[PDB]
Amino acid sequence: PFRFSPEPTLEDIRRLHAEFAAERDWEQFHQPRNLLLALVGEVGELAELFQWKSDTEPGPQAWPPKERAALQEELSDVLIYLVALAARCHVDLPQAVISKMDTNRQRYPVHLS
Amino acid sequence: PFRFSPEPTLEDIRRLHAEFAAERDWEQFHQPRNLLLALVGEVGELAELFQWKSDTEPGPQAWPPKERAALQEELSDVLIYLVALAARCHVDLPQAVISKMDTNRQRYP
C-alpha cells in the first residue's frame, strides 16, 4: 500500500527549482525551452532506462539500486523539469490537471453493465 | 509572486486518475510501457506547441486562451502519467523531488 506524499505543494516544487535555478545560469535554467528539452531528454533517458525490459520481467523494484535509483531519478527530473516549465508558463498545473481530469473524466464515460 | 495551488497534491491528482482508470479500461493503464508511451506521446503533444515558438515572440507567460488550455492539460497529462508511472515503480514523487535536488545541486554547482 504505497502512497506518495501531500507535500510539497506543486507550488513549492515550482519554488525549489527557481531560487535553485537563480544561483545558476539565468537563460539556462530559465529559458522554458531549456527546461522542456531538459525534460524531453529526461523523459528520454527514462525511455531507455526501460528500453530493453520486459513489460513482464522483474520490474523497477527487482533490479540493482543504481537503476531504481536513477530510474527514480529520470522520474524526479522529468517532473522537476515539468514543474519548472509549468511555473514559467504561469500554468497552475494543480488546477489545469483538474478539468483535464474532469475533462478526460467526461470525454471518457465509465462503462457499467 | 505567481502561484500554482497548494493542492491538488501529486497524490490528490494521483487519486483522480487511479480511480478514473479504475472504472475504465484498467489493465490498459496498468502495463508500465503503456503509461510510458502515453507520457511520451503527450510530450510530443506538448513539444508541438513549443516547436515553432521563437524566443522573440510572446512567451509562455503571454500564451493566450487556446494556448494555456492545451499546455495546462498538456503539462497536466504529463504529470498524471508521471505520477502514475512512479507509482507502478514504487517511487514517492512529492517527497523525492527534494531528495533528488542533490543530483542537481551537484549536476550544476
mmCIF file of C-alpha atoms in Angstrom:
data_model
loop_
_atom_site.group_PDB
_atom_site.id
_atom_site.type_symbol
_atom_site.label_atom_id
_atom_site.label_comp_id
_atom_site.label_asym_id
_atom_site.label_seq_id
_atom_site.Cartn_x
_atom_site.Cartn_y
_atom_site.Cartn_z
ATOM 1 C CA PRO A 1 0.000 0.000 0.000
ATOM 2 C CA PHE A 2 2.323 2.728 -1.319
ATOM 3 C CA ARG A 3 1.337 6.412 -1.427
ATOM 4 C CA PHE A 4 3.460 9.499 -2.373
ATOM 5 C CA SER A 5 3.129 12.495 -0.028
ATOM 6 C CA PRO A 6 0.720 15.546 0.205
ATOM 7 C CA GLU A 7 3.741 17.946 0.394
ATOM 8 C CA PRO A 8 5.485 19.824 -1.193
ATOM 9 C CA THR A 9 2.612 21.603 -2.931
ATOM 10 C CA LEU A 10 3.353 21.602 -6.693
ATOM 11 C CA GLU A 11 3.500 25.268 -5.946
ATOM 12 C CA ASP A 12 6.520 24.580 -3.749
ATOM 13 C CA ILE A 13 8.297 22.481 -6.352
ATOM 14 C CA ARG A 14 7.852 25.495 -8.562
ATOM 15 C CA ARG A 15 9.601 27.051 -5.569
ATOM 16 C CA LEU A 16 12.687 24.876 -5.153
ATOM 17 C CA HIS A 17 13.853 24.845 -8.825
ATOM 18 C CA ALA A 18 13.573 28.723 -9.288
ATOM 19 C CA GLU A 19 15.799 30.190 -6.448
ATOM 20 C CA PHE A 20 17.787 26.995 -7.207
ATOM 21 C CA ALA A 21 17.996 27.993 -10.893
ATOM 22 C CA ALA A 22 18.731 31.567 -9.721
ATOM 23 C CA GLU A 23 22.208 30.794 -8.244
ATOM 24 C CA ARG A 24 22.999 29.379 -11.728
ATOM 25 C CA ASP A 25 22.932 30.413 -15.449
ATOM 26 C CA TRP A 26 19.839 32.533 -15.928
ATOM 27 C CA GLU A 27 18.736 31.932 -19.519
ATOM 28 C CA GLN A 28 19.864 28.366 -18.964
ATOM 29 C CA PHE A 29 17.627 27.136 -16.197
ATOM 30 C CA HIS A 30 15.318 29.962 -17.184
ATOM 31 C CA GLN A 31 14.511 29.542 -20.884
ATOM 32 C CA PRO A 32 11.304 27.485 -20.752
ATOM 33 C CA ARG A 33 12.657 25.828 -23.883
ATOM 34 C CA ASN A 34 15.836 24.857 -21.931
ATOM 35 C CA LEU A 35 13.845 23.163 -19.043
ATOM 36 C CA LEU A 36 11.500 21.449 -21.556
ATOM 37 C CA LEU A 37 14.195 19.988 -23.772
ATOM 38 C CA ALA A 38 15.859 19.183 -20.440
ATOM 39 C CA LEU A 39 12.646 17.210 -19.600
ATOM 40 C CA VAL A 40 12.261 15.573 -23.038
ATOM 41 C CA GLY A 41 15.767 14.226 -22.731
ATOM 42 C CA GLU A 42 14.940 13.177 -19.204
ATOM 43 C CA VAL A 43 11.673 11.574 -20.360
ATOM 44 C CA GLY A 44 14.081 10.376 -22.939
ATOM 45 C CA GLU A 45 16.681 8.915 -20.576
ATOM 46 C CA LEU A 46 13.720 7.211 -18.809
ATOM 47 C CA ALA A 47 12.561 5.613 -22.117
ATOM 48 C CA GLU A 48 15.962 3.969 -22.480
ATOM 49 C CA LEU A 49 16.014 3.354 -18.837
ATOM 50 C CA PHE A 50 13.247 0.920 -19.646
ATOM 51 C CA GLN A 51 14.107 0.204 -23.271
ATOM 52 C CA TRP A 52 15.023 -3.474 -23.162
ATOM 53 C CA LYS A 53 12.977 -4.508 -20.039
ATOM 54 C CA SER A 54 10.109 -6.946 -20.448
ATOM 55 C CA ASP A 55 6.700 -5.372 -20.000
ATOM 56 C CA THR A 56 6.863 -8.552 -17.867
ATOM 57 C CA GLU A 57 10.407 -9.241 -16.365
ATOM 58 C CA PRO A 58 11.422 -8.025 -12.802
ATOM 59 C CA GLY A 59 10.060 -4.501 -12.591
ATOM 60 C CA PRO A 60 11.834 -1.386 -11.301
ATOM 61 C CA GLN A 61 11.964 -2.634 -7.704
ATOM 62 C CA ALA A 62 13.560 -6.015 -8.678
ATOM 63 C CA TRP A 63 16.846 -4.504 -10.170
ATOM 64 C CA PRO A 64 20.237 -3.205 -8.903
ATOM 65 C CA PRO A 65 19.726 0.062 -6.888
ATOM 66 C CA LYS A 66 21.814 2.354 -9.108
ATOM 67 C CA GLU A 67 18.909 1.671 -11.519
ATOM 68 C CA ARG A 68 15.672 2.164 -9.449
ATOM 69 C CA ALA A 69 17.955 4.858 -8.152
ATOM 70 C CA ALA A 70 18.367 6.693 -11.452
ATOM 71 C CA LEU A 71 15.052 5.466 -12.850
ATOM 72 C CA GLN A 72 13.570 7.205 -9.759
ATOM 73 C CA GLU A 73 15.913 9.981 -10.918
ATOM 74 C CA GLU A 74 14.784 10.380 -14.526
ATOM 75 C CA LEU A 75 11.300 10.416 -12.939
ATOM 76 C CA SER A 76 12.203 13.058 -10.360
ATOM 77 C CA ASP A 77 13.855 15.078 -13.179
ATOM 78 C CA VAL A 78 11.057 14.714 -15.717
ATOM 79 C CA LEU A 79 8.865 16.163 -13.004
ATOM 80 C CA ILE A 80 11.285 18.820 -11.797
ATOM 81 C CA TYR A 81 11.630 19.936 -15.409
ATOM 82 C CA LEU A 82 7.862 19.560 -15.842
ATOM 83 C CA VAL A 83 7.295 21.686 -12.736
ATOM 84 C CA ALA A 84 9.899 24.354 -13.620
ATOM 85 C CA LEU A 85 8.313 24.829 -17.064
ATOM 86 C CA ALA A 86 4.727 24.944 -15.880
ATOM 87 C CA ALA A 87 5.872 27.551 -13.416
ATOM 88 C CA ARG A 88 7.460 29.663 -16.137
ATOM 89 C CA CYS A 89 4.248 29.408 -18.212
ATOM 90 C CA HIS A 90 2.377 30.571 -15.093
ATOM 91 C CA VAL A 91 0.320 27.467 -15.656
ATOM 92 C CA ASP A 92 -1.389 26.344 -12.465
ATOM 93 C CA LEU A 93 -0.812 22.645 -13.001
ATOM 94 C CA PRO A 94 -2.866 21.783 -9.884
ATOM 95 C CA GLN A 95 -5.898 23.463 -11.407
ATOM 96 C CA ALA A 96 -5.003 22.545 -15.001
ATOM 97 C CA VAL A 97 -4.860 18.781 -14.235
ATOM 98 C CA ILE A 98 -8.290 19.112 -12.599
ATOM 99 C CA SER A 99 -10.582 19.802 -15.556
ATOM 100 C CA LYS A 100 -8.040 17.945 -17.676
ATOM 101 C CA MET A 101 -9.067 15.065 -15.393
ATOM 102 C CA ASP A 102 -12.616 16.390 -15.048
ATOM 103 C CA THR A 103 -12.468 16.833 -18.880
ATOM 104 C CA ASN A 104 -10.898 13.387 -19.506
ATOM 105 C CA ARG A 105 -13.362 12.072 -16.963
ATOM 106 C CA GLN A 106 -16.030 13.500 -19.285
ATOM 107 C CA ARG A 107 -14.879 12.505 -22.810
ATOM 108 C CA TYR A 108 -14.391 9.048 -21.342
ATOM 109 C CA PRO A 109 -17.723 7.986 -19.729
ATOM 110 C CA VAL A 110 -17.075 4.987 -17.424
ATOM 111 C CA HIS A 111 -18.596 1.644 -18.559
ATOM 112 C CA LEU A 112 -21.011 -0.146 -16.220
ATOM 113 C CA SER A 113 -23.139 -3.079 -17.369
ATOM 114 C CA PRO B 1 4.688 36.229 -6.973
ATOM 115 C CA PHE B 2 2.831 33.641 -9.181
ATOM 116 C CA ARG B 3 1.035 30.700 -7.729
ATOM 117 C CA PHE B 4 0.192 27.054 -8.590
ATOM 118 C CA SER B 5 -2.054 25.596 -5.957
ATOM 119 C CA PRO B 6 -1.060 24.044 -2.553
ATOM 120 C CA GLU B 7 -3.281 21.186 -3.666
ATOM 121 C CA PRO B 8 -4.147 19.393 -5.551
ATOM 122 C CA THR B 9 -1.115 17.433 -4.479
ATOM 123 C CA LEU B 10 0.558 14.833 -6.793
ATOM 124 C CA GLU B 11 -1.299 12.361 -4.592
ATOM 125 C CA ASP B 12 -4.592 14.188 -4.903
ATOM 126 C CA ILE B 13 -4.235 14.044 -8.701
ATOM 127 C CA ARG B 14 -2.808 10.570 -8.308
ATOM 128 C CA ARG B 15 -6.221 9.576 -6.928
ATOM 129 C CA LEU B 16 -8.327 11.282 -9.544
ATOM 130 C CA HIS B 17 -6.500 9.026 -12.031
ATOM 131 C CA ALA B 18 -6.123 5.537 -10.336
ATOM 132 C CA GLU B 19 -9.852 5.758 -9.707
ATOM 133 C CA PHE B 20 -10.677 7.230 -13.164
ATOM 134 C CA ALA B 21 -8.888 4.285 -14.784
ATOM 135 C CA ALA B 22 -10.396 2.055 -12.129
ATOM 136 C CA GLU B 23 -13.869 2.436 -13.634
ATOM 137 C CA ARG B 24 -12.420 2.270 -17.205
ATOM 138 C CA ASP B 25 -10.073 0.076 -19.300
ATOM 139 C CA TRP B 26 -7.929 -0.681 -16.272
ATOM 140 C CA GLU B 27 -5.218 -3.185 -17.246
ATOM 141 C CA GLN B 28 -4.617 -0.794 -20.212
ATOM 142 C CA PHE B 29 -3.348 1.702 -17.597
ATOM 143 C CA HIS B 30 -1.512 -0.943 -15.730
ATOM 144 C CA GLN B 31 1.277 -2.108 -18.103
ATOM 145 C CA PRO B 32 4.152 0.327 -17.401
ATOM 146 C CA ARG B 33 5.136 0.870 -21.011
ATOM 147 C CA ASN B 34 1.527 1.794 -21.843
ATOM 148 C CA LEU B 35 1.972 4.694 -19.388
ATOM 149 C CA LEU B 36 5.489 5.491 -20.551
ATOM 150 C CA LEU B 37 4.491 5.686 -24.229
ATOM 151 C CA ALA B 38 1.426 7.783 -23.241
ATOM 152 C CA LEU B 39 3.767 10.141 -21.329
ATOM 153 C CA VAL B 40 5.988 10.302 -24.430
ATOM 154 C CA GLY B 41 3.023 10.963 -26.718
ATOM 155 C CA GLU B 42 1.757 13.844 -24.591
ATOM 156 C CA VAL B 43 5.257 15.281 -24.530
ATOM 157 C CA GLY B 44 5.072 15.480 -28.313
ATOM 158 C CA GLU B 45 1.542 16.913 -27.981
ATOM 159 C CA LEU B 46 3.390 19.411 -25.827
ATOM 160 C CA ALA B 47 6.531 19.964 -27.943
ATOM 161 C CA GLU B 48 4.219 20.590 -30.957
ATOM 162 C CA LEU B 49 3.408 23.973 -29.330
ATOM 163 C CA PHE B 50 6.887 24.860 -28.231
ATOM 164 C CA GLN B 51 8.388 23.763 -31.596
ATOM 165 C CA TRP B 52 7.521 26.764 -33.727
ATOM 166 C CA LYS B 53 7.701 29.304 -30.871
ATOM 167 C CA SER B 54 10.511 31.812 -31.482
ATOM 168 C CA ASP B 55 12.032 33.311 -28.352
ATOM 169 C CA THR B 56 11.294 36.846 -29.620
ATOM 170 C CA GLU B 57 7.542 36.249 -29.940
ATOM 171 C CA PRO B 58 5.105 36.071 -26.975
ATOM 172 C CA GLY B 59 6.470 33.760 -24.307
ATOM 173 C CA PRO B 60 4.813 31.057 -22.187
ATOM 174 C CA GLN B 61 3.570 33.711 -19.724
ATOM 175 C CA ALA B 62 1.713 35.680 -22.522
ATOM 176 C CA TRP B 63 0.377 32.495 -24.015
ATOM 177 C CA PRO B 64 -3.368 33.294 -24.737
ATOM 178 C CA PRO B 65 -6.550 31.136 -24.202
ATOM 179 C CA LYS B 66 -6.400 28.250 -26.661
ATOM 180 C CA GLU B 67 -2.730 28.138 -25.677
ATOM 181 C CA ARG B 68 -2.683 27.841 -21.915
ATOM 182 C CA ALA B 69 -5.570 25.417 -22.011
ATOM 183 C CA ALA B 70 -3.778 22.930 -24.284
ATOM 184 C CA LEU B 71 -0.481 23.478 -22.374
ATOM 185 C CA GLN B 72 -2.090 23.112 -18.986
ATOM 186 C CA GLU B 73 -3.894 19.898 -19.897
ATOM 187 C CA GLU B 74 -0.585 19.002 -21.584
ATOM 188 C CA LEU B 75 1.643 19.751 -18.576
ATOM 189 C CA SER B 76 -1.136 18.013 -16.637
ATOM 190 C CA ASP B 77 -1.348 14.848 -18.802
ATOM 191 C CA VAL B 78 2.458 14.612 -18.443
ATOM 192 C CA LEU B 79 2.126 14.932 -14.706
ATOM 193 C CA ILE B 80 -0.605 12.266 -14.307
ATOM 194 C CA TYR B 81 1.302 9.651 -16.327
ATOM 195 C CA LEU B 82 4.448 10.553 -14.454
ATOM 196 C CA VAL B 83 2.690 10.435 -11.056
ATOM 197 C CA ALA B 84 1.228 7.138 -12.277
ATOM 198 C CA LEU B 85 4.458 5.641 -13.677
ATOM 199 C CA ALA B 86 6.444 6.322 -10.494
ATOM 200 C CA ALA B 87 3.545 4.597 -8.605
ATOM 201 C CA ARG B 88 3.887 1.463 -10.783
ATOM 202 C CA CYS B 89 7.626 1.700 -9.888
ATOM 203 C CA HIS B 90 7.293 2.233 -6.079
ATOM 204 C CA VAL B 91 8.594 5.833 -6.256
ATOM 205 C CA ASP B 92 7.423 8.708 -3.956
ATOM 206 C CA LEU B 93 7.211 11.857 -6.165
ATOM 207 C CA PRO B 94 6.358 14.844 -3.809
ATOM 208 C CA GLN B 95 8.800 13.521 -1.222
ATOM 209 C CA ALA B 96 11.561 12.920 -3.775
ATOM 210 C CA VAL B 97 11.985 15.967 -5.985
ATOM 211 C CA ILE B 98 13.533 17.281 -2.787
ATOM 212 C CA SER B 99 15.663 14.218 -2.328
ATOM 213 C CA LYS B 100 16.856 14.402 -5.976
ATOM 214 C CA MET B 101 17.832 18.028 -5.529
ATOM 215 C CA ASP B 102 21.188 16.574 -4.578
ATOM 216 C CA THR B 103 21.933 15.136 -8.012
ATOM 217 C CA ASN B 104 21.162 18.590 -9.439
ATOM 218 C CA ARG B 105 22.761 20.660 -6.654
ATOM 219 C CA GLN B 106 25.858 18.739 -7.918
ATOM 220 C CA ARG B 107 24.901 18.225 -11.537
ATOM 221 C CA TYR B 108 25.091 22.038 -11.513
ATOM 222 C CA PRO B 109 27.495 23.538 -8.877
#
